[PDB]
Amino acid sequence: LVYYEGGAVCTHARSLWRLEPLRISWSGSHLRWGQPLRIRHVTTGRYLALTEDQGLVVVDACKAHTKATSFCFRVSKEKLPKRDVEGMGPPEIKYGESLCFVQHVASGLWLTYAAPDPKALRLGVLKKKAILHQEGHMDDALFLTRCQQEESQAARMIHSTAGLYNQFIKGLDSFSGKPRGSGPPAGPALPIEAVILSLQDLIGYFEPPSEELQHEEKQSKLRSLRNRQSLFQEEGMLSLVLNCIDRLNVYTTAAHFAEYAGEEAAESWKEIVNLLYELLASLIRGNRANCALFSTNLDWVVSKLDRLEASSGILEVLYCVLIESPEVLNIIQENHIKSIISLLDKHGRNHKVLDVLCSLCVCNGVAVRSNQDLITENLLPGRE
Amino acid sequence: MDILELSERLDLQRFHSHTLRLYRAVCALGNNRVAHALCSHVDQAQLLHALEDAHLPGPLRAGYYDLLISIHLESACRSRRSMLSEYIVPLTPETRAITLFPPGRKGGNARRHGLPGVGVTTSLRPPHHFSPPCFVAALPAAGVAEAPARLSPAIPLEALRDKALRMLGEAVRDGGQHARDPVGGSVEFQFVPVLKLVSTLLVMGIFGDEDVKQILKMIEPEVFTEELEEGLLQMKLPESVKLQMCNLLEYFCDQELQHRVESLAAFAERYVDKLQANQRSRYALLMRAFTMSAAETARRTREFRSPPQEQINMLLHFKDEADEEDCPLPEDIRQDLQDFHQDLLAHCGIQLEKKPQSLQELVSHMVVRWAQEDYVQSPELVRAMFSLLHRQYDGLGELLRALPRAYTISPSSVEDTMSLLECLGQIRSLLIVQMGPQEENLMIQSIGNIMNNKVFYQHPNLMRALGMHETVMEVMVNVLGGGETKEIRFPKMVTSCCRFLCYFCRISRQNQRSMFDHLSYLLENSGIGLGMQGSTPLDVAAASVIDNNELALALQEQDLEKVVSYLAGCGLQSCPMLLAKGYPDIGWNPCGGERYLDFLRFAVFVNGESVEENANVVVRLLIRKPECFGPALRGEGGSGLLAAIEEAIRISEDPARDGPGVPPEENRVHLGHAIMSFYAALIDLLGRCAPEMHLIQAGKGEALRIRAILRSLVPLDDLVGIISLPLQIPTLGKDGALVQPKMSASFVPDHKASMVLFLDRVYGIENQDFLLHVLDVGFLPDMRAAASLDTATFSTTEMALALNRYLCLAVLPLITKCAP
Amino acid sequence: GVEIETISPGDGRTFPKKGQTCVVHYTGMLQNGKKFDSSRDRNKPFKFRIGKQEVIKGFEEGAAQMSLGQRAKLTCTPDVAYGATGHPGVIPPNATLIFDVELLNLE
Amino acid sequence: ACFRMTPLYNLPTHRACNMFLESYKAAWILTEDHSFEDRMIDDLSKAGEQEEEEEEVEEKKPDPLHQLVLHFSRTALTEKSKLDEDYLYMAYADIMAKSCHLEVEVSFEEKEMEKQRLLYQQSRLHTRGAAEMVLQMISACKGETGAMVSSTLKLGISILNGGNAEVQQKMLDYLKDKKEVGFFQSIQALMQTCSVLDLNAFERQNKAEGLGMVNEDGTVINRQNGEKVMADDEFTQDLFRFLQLLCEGHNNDFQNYLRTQTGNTTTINIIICTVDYLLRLQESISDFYWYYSGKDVIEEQGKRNFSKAMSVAKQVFNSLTEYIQGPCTGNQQSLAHSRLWDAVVGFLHVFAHMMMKLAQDSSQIELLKELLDLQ
């Protein structure tokens, strides 16, 4: 359901419209008011349509039957097209000016916000449920604003990538039980190699800039990197990847994993979990807001610190979250500190763990005396 | 294994170097309780031995030096560092002896400048605190969060500073030799940790005068002579060393400033006595000037009929030679001030060659020389270096930036100030640490001593100058912002400080005014303070403005609309904390809105009379936002307030819905009482918002409109009916059990008094018949009840005294003025 | 729960009685054999006022059973020591403490 | 109280010295004049004894000012949500701002000498990146008003004074190749937050002066305590003085860039926004006249209000002239479709009846003579 919305919501990825005309050739021609052209949201890959039971919705491309899914621009609301030219065409519409009026030409109606406001919208967020109205109001003229190429490019990966893991997760829980034994797999094969390629692409796509670069250049790359990570979180990619590690974690060892999926799939298991933690570390690195999300489920990563197959990455993940979000330190309780100290006792004299403790002591220049003492008490007196 | 092998065993070297870092981290930010515990694992002998170990690896050398500083020196360093920004001076002969220039014969305007840090500093700085680290002591019977805080672990400082001085001399002489094997491995690992130790001691003040003289000799001998030995300043040190070098320089740069401040105080001491003496003699002469003068003496004694601020201003108002007519000072005194100005600016390097000869122009040369040698790559080094360069080029401006923290005190109460300052150290130390139960008790006694300190009242300008109120505010800001969404843990200290601030407001108008200037900043943090009782930021906000006609006038629109918007939220949503505690649900918050109403009641009513500007603005926001009125008097479908009161009375009377159905919390909420209390404060607010009668009698245009509006909202039949409602009455019986109502869970006279104030200010009393029709059914039961209850068994009860205040404050003043 | 072993004989006659502060150099020891505390490390004598219960009762009783110049090996069982709580950040709970105490001087 | 208070000689010493110092600073320290800005820069602008090494690169290696400016640009470029305060930035930015201007018929041949030296000092600053430094700081302030941004513009005017063409070119080039959005976003936000004349604050101040209060530590006669009307007036004065300077010399290249941003993703129209601000001003000054019919005479606060308030309109009008002269047709069309005409009407009607009211008496000859040059 389309909604008007105001504020910081629509600087995210969920506000990007692609104008797709009906002509395969010369689709990149200029725009004519009153000419048929579809509307597509990039992240969903769905199309605006006049449905039958819920009015104006988005429909899957499988059912975009060109009747409910066509629209036409106009400068007014008065009842009146020209034939398609195999060329660039004449310049009509402005960017940042030239207020437009979209009309569902097949139905003749007009998109307009629904006036009534229930108790939920009495004081809460002001989102206006736009509805394809028969005549509409007056102030529903619209601007057109250009998003930068980079985020426009970025958006399409979310739609491509998410469906890949949607398939992956469906594969995972399909063989979650039902041991294969010595026979055939559960069902269809999982796009493991494509997933492996995808993760390797994203990790590079999220690599922090190198320190040898000029200052301002580094700052600019941070500007982009910060924007990217927040966009992926706001599209729920972090929720996706956390589901990925969750489903992958139910196997202690590769042969145990192989008992339910398959021997041919068993080799990639350690690789993919290492990629996942590396991707997550890149995802959280540097963003306070993205970082803060682990306060609700801090115990979850602590439940996995004992795992051996991918431990260096997850420890780096923990380093990244603690080095940034002070409130996570305010969530720390004694069981956690017993888990990190156990890591030092189990994984040798890994100096990184010390830096984890050092991050536990002070965060952004404030002392956490409720934690510092627990570090001293559980570590110093034994002297071993 | 030998630690010197770690210069080869790198894989362990990193780990142990990190280990020292972890030791610094756990003892970081003055956690002295931990800092003592460290002294078991690292011993004083080990640290002192490790200082001189030349073959020791670089990173571990710097780590160990920093570990020493953290375990022993940071807490007292940081506290002293903060106290360096203030300049409190005593009226003592040692202060008097302080002079801008040392005695000499170099030049008339300016002799040879005094050596930095060499001399006497009378400025107040509290004593350091130390404890002998001895761990066999019995475990104190005082439990956690109640025992007083552990001091910094002790260590021999006079021996330490001798070792550090000798170490510096070793480094200075070694550096000139241009040896290929610097101590620790690198020049930066050699010079930097030692320079850090010297800087920390310099801040500490451990060094004596001769020690300082030597320090100035090692850094630069020939410039600092008073009447290979090559100093630090030309051995082309790496950038990281230059950072510490700048720290060393700026420490001395503060000394001349503090010297100037004290020298000014000494001048103030000597000069003011001459001023008061001459002004006294002129007074005695002026009283007998009548024999040769006339009414022009009114001009002459205008000075003596003017407050001292302008008296001294006119006394000083002779600088430019075009204003001396009003100056009564003899020319010798007039000369003395200009003389002190001349050498003062000379000591500021304003008015008066390859020999630098002095600190200011030396360091200016130094900074420019460094800058032109290379592009400096450390941003912090750049920032500090230009920080210094500005400080030298503007001697007067930094002094002008220092005087607002300068205060002169009599020597009588210096120990009282010391007592105050140690609490000031506690509060200042608590900005940089998350609050805990131990710290909570620390703050509670920290302010407890402040309220017991008489200087805290005797010199309030000093307290404002220190900005202790600001420092407290930041603490609550952090406490509220931490977990503001859910609920506030540690509320006892929150309400203790909010009690304190209200006390601070009552000290004086100016203290209140400065406290006021952060009013808006309080309001957002007060959005969840409704959960806790006692004292709140909203309470502080109210007392920040109480009975200030200038301030209620200056109370900005944005502030008011922000408050009413909050009140709208309270009037539209339940209280989640009360909802969780078993209480039944209603679609609004009587308690929270009532607190806002009490604020507005102080926001618009000043010194017994309404303020029209605030009154009309607030009612304009109430009318634009009708949800503020609550479910009753809402508009479409909103039942009357008259109808609203009765079930609220029944709710309070009948249990299982007045409260949770599970005082016991000592402030257990009673819904019906809260609902009616909100209504009462709402009426009382409008009543105090009513226009004054001289305005209504003059019939001012818009003024009539407001009174029309309020009369449209509130009908008379409601006013008389609720004013005529019955009251619970104390009775004697049941083995003499004096049945008394619970004032927190029963109908109260105050709520009636609110409406009486409403009727008087809005409708008033016009005709005799309606007067009697109010008297018989509304007032007469009250007087007969009070007169009956006027008995030694009941007159001292809560309800009887409630009526005594109710009648003598609301009914009787109304009746008395309508007697004709 | 304390037992004492002579190390370096002194006088054996002037036992420490109430009234005089005891001046001692000691050297703590973990029971497993880990050195954690001493007085020669800080180089200064540790003088404690007896009878006022400033130190733990095991050390107090051991000091009482000593004599001037008699170096002694103490053994504080946890009951006469920090016990079930331990000195925080230094000594874990439930550990026996061994002390190389040398009462060098009474005043 | 003045008849029966404590005589000054009976005051305690510590109290007396306390008021002594605070009076003394206001009498001698604050009044003191000491110019050192020129010797500041003249020390930091030299390459002292580096000719001996003579490295192969031409790159003039030492430059204390350039490093200082670079450092400020460095901290200006951090990825920080809020822009803090730096006292050194106040000091240095003010120093370099004060260093450029340095300023009965005097002839042309010696006039050009002072202007050519003024350019030289401006060159001495802008050639070391100070021009860009101002630009990033304006981008970084995120439209949040403050002292540091006020000093930033004060510097920008200090280097743009006299309508420096090549400085304007450097400005344009920096925007063109950076394609920054927030600079104009901040400019728009800053101008939207600029205040306008208000009745409520004015009358509240009038009543406050009506009280005629005293403090407890003596008494001050007619104190000039915090002013709530046109507090930010000099901020609005110099903001438009900055925009006028950056369009001075008929920079058709820059005016069209203001009306539309070719490179940038989102275009912000300064001209229409400036008109909208003028509209808010017009209502404010109008309504202030719409408070003066029953009152037939104008007191001091009303006069001082109009004196500062109208200087805003004078500066804005000079700004619009600089946007339009040359002429820039695209801007002319924008104003043709703007709300300027209605604002013009309101100003005319205010000038209409106002100068009658001022003509009724000689008490307001001053304010009338400013109004004359306003329209």
CSV table of N, CA and C in Angstrom, one decimal, chain B residues 234-329:
chain,number,residue,atom,x,y,z
B,234,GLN,N,66.4,22.6,20.1
B,234,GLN,CA,67.0,22.6,18.8
B,234,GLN,C,67.6,21.2,18.4
B,235,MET,N,67.2,20.2,19.0
B,235,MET,CA,67.7,18.8,18.6
B,235,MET,C,66.9,18.2,17.6
B,236,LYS,N,66.1,18.9,16.8
B,236,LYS,CA,65.2,18.5,15.7
B,236,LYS,C,64.4,17.3,16.0
B,237,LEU,N,63.7,17.4,17.1
B,237,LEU,CA,62.9,16.2,17.6
B,237,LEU,C,61.8,15.8,16.6
B,238,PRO,N,61.4,14.5,16.6
B,238,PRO,CA,60.2,14.1,15.9
B,238,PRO,C,58.9,14.8,16.4
B,239,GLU,N,57.9,14.7,15.6
B,239,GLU,CA,56.6,15.4,15.8
B,239,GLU,C,56.0,15.0,17.1
B,240,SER,N,56.0,13.7,17.5
B,240,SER,CA,55.3,13.2,18.7
B,240,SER,C,55.9,13.8,19.9
B,241,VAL,N,57.2,14.0,19.9
B,241,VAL,CA,57.9,14.7,21.1
B,241,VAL,C,57.4,16.1,21.2
B,242,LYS,N,57.2,16.8,20.0
B,242,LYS,CA,56.8,18.2,20.0
B,242,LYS,C,55.5,18.4,20.7
B,243,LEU,N,54.6,17.4,20.7
B,243,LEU,CA,53.3,17.5,21.4
B,243,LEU,C,53.5,17.6,22.9
B,244,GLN,N,54.3,16.8,23.5
B,244,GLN,CA,54.6,16.9,24.9
B,244,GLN,C,55.4,18.2,25.2
B,245,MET,N,56.2,18.6,24.2
B,245,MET,CA,57.0,19.8,24.4
B,245,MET,C,56.1,21.0,24.5
B,246,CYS,N,55.0,21.0,23.7
B,246,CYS,CA,54.0,22.1,23.7
B,246,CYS,C,53.3,22.0,25.0
B,247,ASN,N,53.0,20.8,25.5
B,247,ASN,CA,52.3,20.7,26.8
B,247,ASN,C,53.1,21.3,27.9
B,248,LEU,N,54.5,21.1,27.9
B,248,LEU,CA,55.4,21.7,28.8
B,248,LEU,C,55.3,23.2,28.8
B,249,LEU,N,55.3,23.7,27.5
B,249,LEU,CA,55.4,25.2,27.3
B,249,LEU,C,54.1,25.8,27.9
B,250,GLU,N,52.9,25.2,27.5
B,250,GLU,CA,51.6,25.8,27.8
B,250,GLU,C,51.4,25.8,29.4
B,251,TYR,N,52.0,24.8,30.0
B,251,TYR,CA,51.9,24.8,31.5
B,251,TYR,C,52.5,26.1,32.1
B,252,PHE,N,53.7,26.4,31.6
B,252,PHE,CA,54.4,27.7,32.0
B,252,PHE,C,53.6,28.9,31.6
B,253,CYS,N,53.0,28.8,30.4
B,253,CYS,CA,52.1,29.9,29.8
B,253,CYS,C,51.0,30.2,30.8
B,254,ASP,N,50.5,29.2,31.5
B,254,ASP,CA,49.4,29.5,32.4
B,254,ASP,C,49.9,30.2,33.7
B,255,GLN,N,51.2,30.0,34.0
B,255,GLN,CA,51.8,30.5,35.3
B,255,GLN,C,51.8,32.0,35.3
B,256,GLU,N,52.3,32.6,34.2
B,256,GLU,CA,52.3,34.1,34.1
B,256,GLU,C,50.9,34.7,34.2
B,257,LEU,N,49.9,34.0,33.5
B,257,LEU,CA,48.5,34.4,33.6
B,257,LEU,C,48.0,34.4,35.1
B,258,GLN,N,48.3,33.3,35.8
B,258,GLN,CA,47.9,33.2,37.2
B,258,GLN,C,48.7,34.2,38.1
B,259,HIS,N,49.9,34.4,37.7
B,259,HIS,CA,50.7,35.5,38.3
B,259,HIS,C,50.1,36.8,38.1
B,260,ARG,N,49.6,37.1,36.9
B,260,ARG,CA,49.0,38.4,36.6
B,260,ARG,C,47.8,38.6,37.4
B,261,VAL,N,46.9,37.5,37.5
B,261,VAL,CA,45.7,37.6,38.2
B,261,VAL,C,45.9,37.9,39.7
B,262,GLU,N,46.9,37.2,40.3
B,262,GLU,CA,47.2,37.4,41.7
B,262,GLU,C,47.8,38.8,41.9
B,263,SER,N,48.7,39.2,41.0
B,263,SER,CA,49.3,40.6,41.1
B,263,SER,C,48.3,41.7,41.0
B,264,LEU,N,47.2,41.5,40.2
B,264,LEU,CA,46.1,42.3,40.1
B,264,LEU,C,45.3,42.3,41.4
B,265,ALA,N,45.2,41.2,42.0
B,265,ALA,CA,44.5,41.1,43.3
B,265,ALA,C,45.2,41.8,44.4
B,266,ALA,N,46.6,41.7,44.4
B,266,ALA,CA,47.4,42.4,45.3
B,266,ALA,C,47.3,43.9,45.1
B,267,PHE,N,47.3,44.4,43.9
B,267,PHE,CA,47.0,45.8,43.5
B,267,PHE,C,45.6,46.2,44.0
B,268,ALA,N,44.6,45.4,43.8
B,268,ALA,CA,43.3,45.7,44.3
B,268,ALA,C,43.3,45.8,45.8
B,269,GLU,N,44.0,45.0,46.5
B,269,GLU,CA,44.1,45.0,48.0
B,269,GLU,C,44.7,46.3,48.4
B,270,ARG,N,45.8,46.7,47.8
B,270,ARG,CA,46.5,48.0,48.3
B,270,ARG,C,45.7,49.2,47.8
B,271,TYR,N,45.2,49.2,46.6
B,271,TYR,CA,44.6,50.4,46.0
B,271,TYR,C,43.2,50.7,46.6
B,272,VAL,N,42.4,49.7,46.8
B,272,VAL,CA,41.0,49.9,47.3
B,272,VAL,C,41.0,50.5,48.7
B,273,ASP,N,42.0,50.1,49.5
B,273,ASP,CA,42.1,50.7,50.9
B,273,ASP,C,42.4,52.2,50.8
B,274,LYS,N,43.2,52.7,49.8
B,274,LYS,CA,43.4,54.1,49.6
B,274,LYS,C,42.1,54.7,49.1
B,275,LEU,N,41.4,54.0,48.2
B,275,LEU,CA,40.1,54.6,47.7
B,275,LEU,C,39.1,54.8,48.8
B,276,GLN,N,38.9,53.8,49.7
B,276,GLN,CA,38.0,53.9,50.8
B,276,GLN,C,38.4,55.0,51.8
B,277,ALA,N,39.8,55.1,52.0
B,277,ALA,CA,40.3,56.1,52.9
B,277,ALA,C,40.0,57.5,52.4
B,278,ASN,N,40.4,57.8,51.1
B,278,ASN,CA,40.2,59.1,50.6
B,278,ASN,C,38.7,59.4,50.5
B,279,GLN,N,37.9,58.5,50.1
B,279,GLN,CA,36.4,58.7,50.0
B,279,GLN,C,35.8,59.0,51.4
B,280,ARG,N,36.4,58.4,52.4
B,280,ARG,CA,36.0,58.7,53.8
B,280,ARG,C,36.3,60.1,54.2
B,281,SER,N,37.6,60.5,53.9
B,281,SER,CA,38.0,61.8,54.3
B,281,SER,C,37.2,62.9,53.5
B,282,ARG,N,36.9,62.6,52.2
B,282,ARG,CA,36.1,63.5,51.4
B,282,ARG,C,34.7,63.6,52.0
B,283,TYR,N,34.2,62.5,52.6
B,283,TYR,CA,32.9,62.5,53.2
B,283,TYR,C,32.8,63.5,54.3
B,284,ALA,N,33.8,63.3,55.2
B,284,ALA,CA,33.9,64.2,56.4
B,284,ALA,C,34.0,65.6,56.0
B,285,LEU,N,34.9,65.9,55.0
B,285,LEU,CA,35.1,67.3,54.6
B,285,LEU,C,33.8,67.8,53.9
B,286,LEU,N,33.1,67.0,53.1
B,286,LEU,CA,31.8,67.4,52.5
B,286,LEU,C,30.7,67.7,53.4
B,287,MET,N,30.7,67.0,54.6
B,287,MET,CA,29.6,67.3,55.6
B,287,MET,C,29.8,68.7,56.2
B,288,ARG,N,31.0,69.3,56.2
B,288,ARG,CA,31.3,70.6,56.6
B,288,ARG,C,31.5,71.6,55.5
B,289,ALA,N,31.3,71.1,54.2
B,289,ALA,CA,31.3,72.0,53.1
B,289,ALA,C,30.2,73.0,52.9
B,290,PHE,N,29.1,72.9,53.8
B,290,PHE,CA,28.0,73.7,53.7
B,290,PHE,C,28.3,75.2,54.0
B,291,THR,N,29.4,75.5,54.7
B,291,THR,CA,29.8,76.8,55.1
B,291,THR,C,30.2,77.7,54.0
B,292,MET,N,30.6,77.1,52.8
B,292,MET,CA,31.0,77.9,51.7
B,292,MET,C,30.3,77.4,50.4
B,293,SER,N,29.3,76.5,50.5
B,293,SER,CA,28.6,76.0,49.3
B,293,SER,C,27.1,76.1,49.4
B,294,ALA,N,26.5,75.5,48.4
B,294,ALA,CA,25.0,75.6,48.2
B,294,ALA,C,24.6,74.3,47.6
B,295,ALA,N,23.4,74.3,47.0
B,295,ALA,CA,22.7,73.1,46.4
B,295,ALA,C,23.6,72.3,45.3
B,296,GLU,N,24.7,72.9,44.9
B,296,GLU,CA,25.7,72.1,44.1
B,296,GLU,C,26.3,71.0,44.9
B,297,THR,N,26.2,71.0,46.2
B,297,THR,CA,26.5,69.9,47.0
B,297,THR,C,25.7,68.6,46.7
B,298,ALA,N,24.5,68.8,46.1
B,298,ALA,CA,23.7,67.7,45.7
B,298,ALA,C,24.4,66.8,44.7
B,299,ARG,N,25.0,67.5,43.7
B,299,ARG,CA,25.9,66.9,42.7
B,299,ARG,C,27.1,66.3,43.4
B,300,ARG,N,27.7,67.0,44.4
B,300,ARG,CA,28.9,66.4,45.1
B,300,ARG,C,28.5,65.2,45.9
B,301,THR,N,27.4,65.2,46.6
B,301,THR,CA,27.0,64.0,47.4
B,301,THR,C,26.1,63.0,46.7
B,302,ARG,N,25.9,63.3,45.3
B,302,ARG,CA,25.3,62.3,44.5
B,302,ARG,C,26.1,61.0,44.5
B,303,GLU,N,27.4,61.1,44.5
B,303,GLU,CA,28.3,59.9,44.6
B,303,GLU,C,28.0,59.2,45.9
B,304,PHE,N,27.8,59.9,47.0
B,304,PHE,CA,27.5,59.2,48.3
B,304,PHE,C,26.0,58.8,48.4
B,305,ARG,N,25.2,59.3,47.5
B,305,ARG,CA,23.8,58.9,47.3
B,305,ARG,C,23.6,58.0,46.1
B,306,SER,N,24.7,57.3,45.7
B,306,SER,CA,24.6,56.3,44.6
B,306,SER,C,25.2,55.0,45.1
B,307,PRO,N,24.7,53.9,44.6
B,307,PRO,CA,25.3,52.6,45.0
B,307,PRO,C,26.7,52.5,44.6
B,308,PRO,N,27.5,51.6,45.3
B,308,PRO,CA,29.0,51.6,45.1
B,308,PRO,C,29.5,51.3,43.7
B,309,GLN,N,28.7,50.5,42.9
B,309,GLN,CA,29.1,50.1,41.6
B,309,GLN,C,29.4,51.3,40.7
B,310,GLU,N,28.4,52.2,40.7
B,310,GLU,CA,28.6,53.5,39.9
B,310,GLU,C,29.6,54.4,40.6
B,311,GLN,N,29.7,54.3,42.0
B,311,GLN,CA,30.7,55.1,42.7
B,311,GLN,C,32.1,54.8,42.2
B,312,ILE,N,32.5,53.5,42.3
B,312,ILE,CA,33.8,53.1,41.8
B,312,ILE,C,33.9,53.3,40.3
B,313,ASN,N,32.9,53.1,39.5
B,313,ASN,CA,33.0,53.4,38.1
B,313,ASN,C,33.3,54.9,37.8
B,314,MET,N,32.6,55.8,38.5
B,314,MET,CA,33.0,57.2,38.3
B,314,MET,C,34.3,57.5,39.0
B,315,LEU,N,34.7,56.8,40.0
B,315,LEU,CA,36.1,56.9,40.5
B,315,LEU,C,37.2,56.5,39.5
B,316,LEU,N,36.9,55.5,38.7
B,316,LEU,CA,37.8,55.0,37.7
B,316,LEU,C,37.7,55.7,36.4
B,317,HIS,N,36.6,56.6,36.3
B,317,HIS,CA,36.2,57.2,35.0
B,317,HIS,C,37.1,58.4,34.7
B,318,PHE,N,38.4,58.2,34.6
B,318,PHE,CA,39.3,59.3,34.3
B,318,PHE,C,40.4,58.9,33.4
B,319,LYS,N,40.2,57.8,32.7
B,319,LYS,CA,41.3,57.2,31.9
B,319,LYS,C,41.7,58.0,30.7
B,320,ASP,N,40.8,58.7,30.0
B,320,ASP,CA,41.0,59.2,28.7
B,320,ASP,C,41.3,60.7,28.7
B,321,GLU,N,41.5,61.3,29.9
B,321,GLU,CA,41.8,62.7,30.2
B,321,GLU,C,40.7,63.7,29.8
B,322,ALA,N,39.6,63.2,29.3
B,322,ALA,CA,38.4,64.0,28.9
B,322,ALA,C,37.2,63.7,29.9
B,323,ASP,N,37.5,63.0,31.0
B,323,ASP,CA,36.4,62.6,31.9
B,323,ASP,C,36.8,62.9,33.4
B,324,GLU,N,37.9,63.5,33.6
B,324,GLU,CA,38.5,63.7,35.0
B,324,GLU,C,37.6,64.6,35.8
B,325,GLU,N,36.7,65.3,35.3
B,325,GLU,CA,35.9,66.3,36.0
B,325,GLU,C,35.1,65.6,37.1
B,326,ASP,N,34.6,64.4,36.9
B,326,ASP,CA,33.8,63.7,38.0
B,326,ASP,C,34.7,62.9,38.9
B,327,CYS,N,36.0,62.8,38.5
B,327,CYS,CA,36.9,62.0,39.4
B,327,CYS,C,37.4,62.9,40.5
B,328,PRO,N,37.2,62.5,41.8
B,328,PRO,CA,37.6,63.3,42.9
B,328,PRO,C,39.0,62.9,43.4
B,329,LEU,N,39.7,61.9,42.8
B,329,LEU,CA,40.9,61.4,43.3
B,329,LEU,C,42.1,62.4,43.1
